[PDB]
């Protein structure tokens, strides 16, 4: 028996030609989240509500709908019920959806729930644009360099979850099979081995690359860089840079830069060349820190998004605000980035930040980008201002100590 | 027929009982190394020299042999001539050899050149320490708080080179094998779709975190952090982590601190206890820029060990003097860390930091301890002189401008 209630008032946005109608009461499902989701998403829950009420004089309201994943999940609906099977259907249903952080439990098998959700729903991009806020304590020099959008595939790579446990009878079957029937001789000690599996398709490879091409045309960004490990996993890493290069030639029209290998595409909207080029991972890793002003959109694979969106959010000072969303060809789940951090939950203390900017996307990707704006407008604001959160303002001196609440209020102030 | 010319005077070092002894006048072993090689081989050698004359008053002196790898190798053996059967054997029967940067081709399935020496020599602890030079231009406000130490396994992980190419008969015997025969339905698209393999053993993970704590009770260190993605990856980044945990226990006595999951391990020679824990992969690639003064030895697998490397090179400023040895349990090979910058190649330009940091590490494995010390006394003094090669220069102001070898002389000068 559900225990969602679906809002009276609301109709559900609808997907026609690949393009969103949403309507002016749109129904919008948001997971609270564990741990401190329930200080953040409140806060959020006021702030979009603030920013859509602004924009649109009252012409539009959403109709937030409350649905079920994680620790809350089980305590609603029962014993490991940990991702209710209504919950998938009613973020594809209702096209457009929202959550806090999720406690996924150690001890009974279970897998990232945050994974599960994105390959369940096929949401094949994550989306994580990282920019420096003005005000914003960094540890380095000049974070305000740093405006980078990384799409993150979200569907393959060693996140498929494919793997045996050393000892086990299946680890040592395709271990033989490895051995014995591929000829493999590199396995330095086929004794007491875990066995993982990286697949990467082309397809898998091309569905990502083509978002981020296609985000940099309709935002006129200035180049996309392949990052990946080509050089080692030639067959994965690298397949999916030469299948990026390849899509950006076949479907955009790329023209050879001098000897190559970069590319260059032209923007039909505004005649920008846009870069297209790659960098192995190690070194990108050092660039973003030593030349940031030369990246901008990322196409990566996985486990090496998981890595720079990581690497990105902590240099411009964004750990606890960096916004994302998983995207999919029929629905999206825009996200809370950060952990649950269990000790701060209900102390109404913990940075809303990175909620509230994912619900920034959400409205952008609605076409509400009145809305959108002005959560940007009044995030900077707040932050310039040196109202806010403690983890801002241990670092800083002279600003002025809000509650997780209160910076709400105060990016509502800002707009 | 060989072109290795074994020098009349030196001696052969010898192993016994796990403790090398080297004599007085030891060959040594060099690959010049490709490109820039030439610039900074022949600084490494002088600097080496000097502080080995200074040292030890004349007593003592390195008889130089060099053997061949790389892009040389071709043109002193013949056509894809790479990497000769000798220079394996004369590393093994050597014990200690320090190579430049080498170049691995492009187009005749050759993989990284680097890689095949670690491997085929049992190279299983790739070692790269990271501090900060004072005077250093670093993207960071406060470097000088990183000081660590990387024992990165080098033997197994993703770089083992399983994997297979999309659409080839095998990739597709490989992946029908997974889906028919171990059940696999994880794959998102199995066609088109290259395929890589990730082992980790027990024995494999034990043998490098064993040198790790090894290395933490010899010098005194505070703490030795496992990193791991065990989240996702549990059977091969997750058991790495749970078999180093349960070495300290089992063979250091490791102790829970609190409620766990962190250790205590009593160092033997000082009482002073070693905290032995973990982090998430993504989350240190955040923790070493945010909070880098709480870490110290840093034991991970291979492909997160190419990655941290790197991140924490480019952070200290020291991107191009970052110093590594290869090493086993026969032999080791210390080497220049950077790439080939054939651009620069005979312009007696470029940094020779890293090779030279990386002679510091090889005198100091000989046991040569006052020789080692005076090159990092060395480095101090002329980084901290701002008298440095143009990738320092370039950064900052009012330094003077030296060529590759003029800086290998002020590191002798500040001796
Ligand atoms: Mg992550
Ligand atoms: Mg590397």
Chains 1, 2 share one sequence.
Not at 1 to 14: H, N
Not at 116 to 145: F, N
Not at 346 to 374: C, F, Y
Request: glycine share 10%; aromatic share 8%; with cysteine.
């Amino acid at each position: 028996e559900s225990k969602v209630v679906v809002p009276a008032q609301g109709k559900k946005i609808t997907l026609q030609n690949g393009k969103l109608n949403v309507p002016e009461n749109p129904i919008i499902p948001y997971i609270e989240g564990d741990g401190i989701g329930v200080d953040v998403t409140p806060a959020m829950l006021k702030v979009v509500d603030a920013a859509v009420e602004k924009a649109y004089k009252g012409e539009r309201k959403i109709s937030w709908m409350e649905i079920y994943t994680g620790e809350k999940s089980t305590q609603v609906y029962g014993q490991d019920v940990w991702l209710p099977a209504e919950t998938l259907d009613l973020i594809r249903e209702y096209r457009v959806a929202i959550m806090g952080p999720l406690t996924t439990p150690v001890g009974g098998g279970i897998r990232s729930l945050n994974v599960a959700l994105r390959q369940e729903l096929d949401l094949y991009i994550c989306l994580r644009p990282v920019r420096y806020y003005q005000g914003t304590p960094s540890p380095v020099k000049h974070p305000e360099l740093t405006d980078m959008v990384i799409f993150r595939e979200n569907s393959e790579d060693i996140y498929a979850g494919i793997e045996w446990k050393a000892d086990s009878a299946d680890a040592e079957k395709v271990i033989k099979f490895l051995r014995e029937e591929m000829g493999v001789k590199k396995i330095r000690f086929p004794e007491h081995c875990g066995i993982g599996i990286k697949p990467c398709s082309e397809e898998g490879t091309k569905r990502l690359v083509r978002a981020a091409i296609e985000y940099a045309i309709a935002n006129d960004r200035d180049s996309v860089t392949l990052v990946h490990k080509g050089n080692i996993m030639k067959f994965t890493e690298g397949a999916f840079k030469d299948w990026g290069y390849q899509l950006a030639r076949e479907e955009f029209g790329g023209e050879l830069i001098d000897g190559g290998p970069w590319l260059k595409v032209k923007n039909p909207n505004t005649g920008k060349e846009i870069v297209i080029k790659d960098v192995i991972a190690d070194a990108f890793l050092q660039q973003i820190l030593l030349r940031p002003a030369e990246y901008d959109v990322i196409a990566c694979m996985n486990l090496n998004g998981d890595y720079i969106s990581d690497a990105l959010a902590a240099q411009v000072g964004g750990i606890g605000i960096a916004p994302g969303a998983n995207i999919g060809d029929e629905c999206a789940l825009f996200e809370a980035t950060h952990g649950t951090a269990p000790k701060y939950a209900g102390q109404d203390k913990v940075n809303p930040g990175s909620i509230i900017l994912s619900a920034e996307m959400m409205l952008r990707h609605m076409g509400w980008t009145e809305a959108a704006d002005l959560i940007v407008k009044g995030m900077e604001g707040a932050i310039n201002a040196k109202t806010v959160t403690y983890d801002f303002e241990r670092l800083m001196d002279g600003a002025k100590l809000l509650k997780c609440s209160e910076f709400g209020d105060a990016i509502i102030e800002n707009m």
